[PDB]
Symmetry: C2
């Protein structure tokens, strides 16, 4: 047999970083103005150390964007990076080492014209300049401190009615690239909030060149979920 | 000593390719319409196998754009890729193997708003998501069949007055990323047209996170050079 298996391999960072790609020289940037303000955005296509995995990373005036991916090993309780919103893993490290991926999946689009969806994509081992369909074995997910804490203690913007009771749940849906297949997973069921790394089998997605993500909470108001739609992932394992 | 030296390492291709990155799923795309037509563009940031080097690649309705980089090992006299314009190296292969870089440097800008310059850039060895300043030792350049043939036999659009005499010359200028330094090199002097790989020492550029390029020919008309502004490069050697 010569089926090859490829596992996400994140960079090892000098000290404690939130990596949203180069901010001085981003791949792209733009501004949006509305009646409520003008906001500046920067976009970088992040890649892992192996060159197999790529991730869409939007950042803005206000930090990590709502539909974006970034890498971190920030364990230091005080990066000012997480002063406002603690996107770090509740597990405090990755599955196999200290770096993991933070993910925003609020459901807004990215790109100057809001027409692109934030995604992870897979490249050919022999040519990083071509996407390739793989069988996705799965990946590990866990909660962010930000979301865990909202569901446990109402520490977010809306306060006390964020707190999960036994009717509640927080569901991650993982899609294939064109979204014709998905797998559902729970980050929280009732008052049981995931605080470990959890493997999600994604083999039922079939061959695909990438992954997209959605979040649903039972705590919501008219405009969206009260639960922050940030989580973490690691260990994406694909096979050709 | 632990100064590290990094040399461009291009992908090895299955058979004979012109690689302008994924055309079905490009990093970006846009359209421009004017009074003369509407043209579609695709952009990919190419990276080498080592992950140290990145290249801006614009392609369009009409193929390889005028200010762009692409990779090729196409030796086969008939890729239809080179039917119209033969961007291949006059040397027919790279310095150390069959792949090399084809370069358009007409001086137009890229990006939906024509505000970005096509460039090569350097990333940190430990983190492909950060640009890093390096000392650039140099690289090899040579002519494209397209330009060589124009200068030798007037086989381009304008025909016979493309042919170089002893007053003529074709000069490549290599700049550092912010263009505050450059090095000049000749692809042709008089009727002597470069047909080998030629090393250009770029140490005088100082530390830089990338490279840009211009071409000047003594054969020109009111609107630009008659000599096609395409050439080839290989073997970029940088040091930190």
């Amino acid at each position: 047999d010569d089926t090859k298996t490829y596992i996400l391999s994140l960079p090892n960072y000098e000290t404690h970083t939130l990596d949203m790609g180069d901010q001085e020289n981003p791949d792209d940037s733009w501004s949006v103005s509305s009646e409520w303000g003008t906001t500046n955005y920067k976009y970088n296509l992040l890649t892992d150390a192996s060159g197999i995995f790529e991730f869409d990373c939007v950042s803005s005036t206000y930090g990590f964007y709502s539909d974006s991916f970034a890498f971190t090993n920030c364990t230091v309780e005080d990066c000012p990076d997480f002063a406002s919103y603690d996107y770090r893993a509740i597990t405090k490290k990755g599955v196999i080492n200290n770096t993991y991926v933070i993910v925003g999946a609020a459901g807004y689009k990215i790109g100057k014209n809001s027409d692109k969806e934030a995604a992870i994509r897979f490249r050919d081992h022999d040519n990083p300049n071509e996407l390739e369909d793989y069988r996705v074995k799965g990946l590990y997910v866990t909660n962010s401190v930000y979301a865990y804490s909202s569901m446990k203690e109402g520490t977010g913007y809306y306060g006390e009615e964020e707190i999960f009771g036994s009717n509640d749940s927080f569901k991650l849906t993982i899609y294939n690239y064109d979204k014709t297949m998905h797998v559902d997973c729970y980050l929280a069921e009732g008052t049981n909030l995931l605080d470990q790394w959890k493997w999600v089998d994604l083999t039922s997605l079939g061959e695909t060149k990438g992954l997209k993500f959605s979040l649903t909470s039972t705590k919501k108001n008219e405009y969206g979920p009260l639960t922050p739609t940030y989580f973490c992932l690691d260990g994406i394992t694909i096979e050709d």
